[PDB]
Amino acid sequence: SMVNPTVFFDIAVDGEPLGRVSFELFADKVPKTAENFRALSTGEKGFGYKGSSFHRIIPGFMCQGGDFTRHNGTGGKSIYGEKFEDENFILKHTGPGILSMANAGPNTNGSQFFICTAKTEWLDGKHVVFGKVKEGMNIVEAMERFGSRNGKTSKKITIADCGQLE
Amino acid sequence: SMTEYKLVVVGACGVGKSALTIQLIQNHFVDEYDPTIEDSYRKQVVIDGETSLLDILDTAGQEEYSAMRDQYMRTGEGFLLVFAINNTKSFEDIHHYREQIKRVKDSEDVPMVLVGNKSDLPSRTVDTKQAQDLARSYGIPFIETSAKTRQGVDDAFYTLVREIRKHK
Ligand SMILES: *CC(=O)N1CC(C(=O)N(C)[C@H](C(=O)N[C@H]2Cc3cc(O)cc(c3)-c3ccc4c(C#N)cn(c4c3)CC(C)(C)COC(=O)[C@@H]3CCCN(N3)C2=O)C(C)C)C1
Ligand SMILES: Nc1nc2c(ncn2[C@@H]2O[C@H](COP(=O)(O)OP(=O)(O)NP(=O)(O)O)[C@@H](O)[C@H]2O)c(=O)[nH]1
Numbered sequence A: 001s002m003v004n005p006t007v008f009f010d011i012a013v014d015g016e017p018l019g020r021v022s023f024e025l026f027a028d029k030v031p032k033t034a035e036n037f038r039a040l041s042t043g044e045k046g047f048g049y050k051g052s053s054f055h056r057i058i059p060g061f062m063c064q065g066g067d068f069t070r071h072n073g074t075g076g077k078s079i080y081g082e083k084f085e086d087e088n089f090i091l092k093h094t095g096p097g098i099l100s101m102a103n104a105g106p107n108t109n110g111s112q113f114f115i116c117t118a119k120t121e122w123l124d125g126k127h128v129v130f131g132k133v134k135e136g137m138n139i140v141e142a143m144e145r146f147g148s149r150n151g152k153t154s155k156k157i158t159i160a161d162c163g164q165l166e
Numbered sequence B: 001s002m003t004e005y006k007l008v009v010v011g012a013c014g015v016g017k018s019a020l021t022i023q024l025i026q027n028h029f030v031d032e033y034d035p036t037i038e039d040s041y042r043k044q045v046v047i048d049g050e051t052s053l054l055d056i057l058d059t060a061g062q063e064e065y066s067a068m069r070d071q072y073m074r075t076g077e078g079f080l081l082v083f084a085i086n087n088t089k090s091f092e093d094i095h096h097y098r099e100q101i102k103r104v105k106d107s108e109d110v111p112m113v114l115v116g117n118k119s120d121l122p123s124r125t126v127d128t129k130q131a132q133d134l135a136r137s138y139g140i141p142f143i144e145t146s147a148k149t150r151q152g153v154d155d156a157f158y159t160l161v162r163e164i165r166k167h168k
């Protein structure tokens, strides 16, 4: 038996600590996608989210991050040696806190993800939902103040540390 | 007084919408690809001896984000419909952007220019004749451009301004 994992990000704003966000990962329904995000959060394969930034923050919509390989939001990689398939579309973008995969079309999952700050139903069936904020939604809300209509951020929002809890 | 023209650049991913806009605004070209959500620019130009203010809305999103792009397109007075000569999908997509313009502007007669970009490339998948025939079927100009060499860049934007002036 295994309970759904819990991971955390410690968020910083221009290097200054902001707070902790934790996530439940729905390994019970999307095990491969949950496992990718979990391992990238611990860094246990030698690469992952620590030190990366949220390169798009769109108030009222989502915060996107996870590119730890390129400078322009085109990078990142999964733990599977290649971009991986959309595992399933069981779960929907139902409201604030939903954690879902960014992609460049069908079956192109890498490491980039987004945290919804509202219901984003138009993304259902194209982005794999795999988790949800557990604690620290107020920190995600604080992050939104640094975004803009087109996602450009006015301060550098980073994952100063990340890992697994419990 | 100085008249302002609201120009909107649309088309499929990677065709060169931003590179064309940056050539107009900043007079350079880079190979780096920085994907757009939306970016707005302003620049004063002289067209046919008249100083004019251009507002350029550089768009993105293809079909998945088309409903959001409607809101930027609704601002526009004229449109560049951009495809790349080595990208068949981008040419097949032009119809979608044309229909989106007609819907959001609620008009069958909207100032537009068809732009065939990447004309510097040594290979192509879309015939120039296809683009000429498409533009003729829409009753709009067709301009061959390269953001890399600057071929046709001023002509595309200035022609669009003249199309707006003929519509009024
Ligand atoms: C066009 C093309 O070939 N590519 C490859 C690039 C790409 O897919 N990435 C860089 C991937 C990525 O970030 N995916 C992203 C979907 C997306 C990418 C890009 O470049 C633009 C937009 C979406 C986009 C464009 C216009 C637009 C409007 C308007 N008008 C409104 N929105 C747009 C998005 C919606 C939002 C809410 C304002 C912004 O939405 C996002 O940023 C979107 C949310 C869901 C997750 N997500 N981004 C993606 O998956 C990389 C992962 C490689 C572009
Ligand atoms: N050879 C050549 N490359 C070009 C030309 N225009 C753009 N490119 C290249 O094509 C890539 C995409 O250009 P870009 O302007 O970002 O395209 P876009 O239509 O704005 N993309 P998006 O829809 O994601 O915002 C870049 O690597 C750029 O250098 C051109 O006229 N010739």
Ligand SMILES: [Mg+2]
Residues within 6 Å of the ligand: B017, B018, B019, B034, B035, B036, B058, B059, B060
């Ligand atoms: Mg662009």
